[PDB]
Design a protein around this ligand. Structure first.
Ligand SMILES: *C(=O)c1c(Cl)cccc1NC(=O)[C@@H](NC(=O)OC(C)(C)C)C(C)C
Ligand SMILES: [Ca+2]
Length: 240
């Protein structure tokens, strides 16, 4: 997150870190949302490589023992059947990870609340992006979970030429674009938390930014609109 602030330790407890076994270490690659004690929603792009993946729930500081962490194997990965690796702009940037164990819910580890199917937000809707990804374009990962206020930019504005044009579909959410605050490499797969009837719900899954750079004026961070996927999501869960 570019232009963030250090989150309080307990503000976002459906945040996970998506990690890969890197030599004899584990490295942070992505974000996620714990949506069941045994199911994590992430980007398809985050599980494109054939790597060994684990999830960490209760994470605050990537480099230090918080005493809250739970470390869990990925058992199964189901990417959306229309995801294409070479077309992120075609959307379907969603995966559902079944973990090896169920996690224990406490004040640090809670389920994300997902939108009702088909819910769109009004432009300029109040939303936060969370993550441990780069804190500058071409910069470095954060050690602590950062959060940025990133209002939504409605489709009609977002899909306009001056914004993203046709790169953005209506199965996506666009949020931000101020030139100062954004998602960046490493936040991908994570939550866009939006305040709806007094409750934060996960409306985004962080998918992409502009190749010019992460914080670019009139290039919002682009998210997979979760509310376009709720039957899919429940259909995977019911059946696996
Ligand atoms: C998200 O996929 C993403 C965004 Cl939101 C903007 C720019 C690039 C990417 N790429 C990624 O996040 C890649 N992850 C990555 O580089 O993770 C770190 C920085 C931790 C090494 C994915 C392809 C995994
Ligand atoms: Ca830690």
């Amino acid at each position: 997150v570019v232009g963030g602030t250090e989150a309080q330790r307990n503000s976002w407890p459906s945040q996970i870190s998506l990690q890969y076994r890197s030599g004899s270490s584990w490295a942070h690659t992505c974000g996620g949302t714990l949506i069941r004690q045994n199911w994590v929603m992430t980007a398809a792009h985050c599980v494109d490589r054939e790597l060994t993946f684990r999830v960490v729930v209760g994470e605050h500081n990537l480099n230090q023992n918080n005493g809250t962490e739970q470390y869990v194997g990925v058992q199964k990965i189901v990417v959306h059947p229309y995801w294409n690796t070479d077309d992120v702009a075609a959307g379907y940037d969603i995966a559902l990870l079944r973990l090896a164990q169920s996690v224990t819910l406490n004040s640090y580890v809670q389920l994300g609340v997902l939108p009702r199917a088909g819910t769109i937000l009004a432009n300029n809707s109040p939303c936060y992006i969370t993550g441990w990804g780069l804190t500058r374009t071409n910069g470095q990962l954060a050690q602590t979970l950062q959060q940025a206020y990133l209002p939504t930019v409605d489709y009609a504005i977002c899909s306009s030429s001056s914004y993203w044009g046709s790169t953005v579909k209506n199965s996506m959410v666009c949020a931000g674009g101020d030139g100062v605050r954004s998602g960046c490499q490493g936040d991908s797969g994570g939550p866009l938390h939006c305040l709806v009837n007094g409750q934060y719900a996960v409306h985004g899954v962080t998918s992409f930014v502009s190749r010019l750079g992460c914080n670019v004026t009139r290039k919002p961070t682009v998210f997979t609109r979760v509310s376009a996927y709720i039957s899919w999501i429940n259909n995977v869960i019911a059946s696996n």
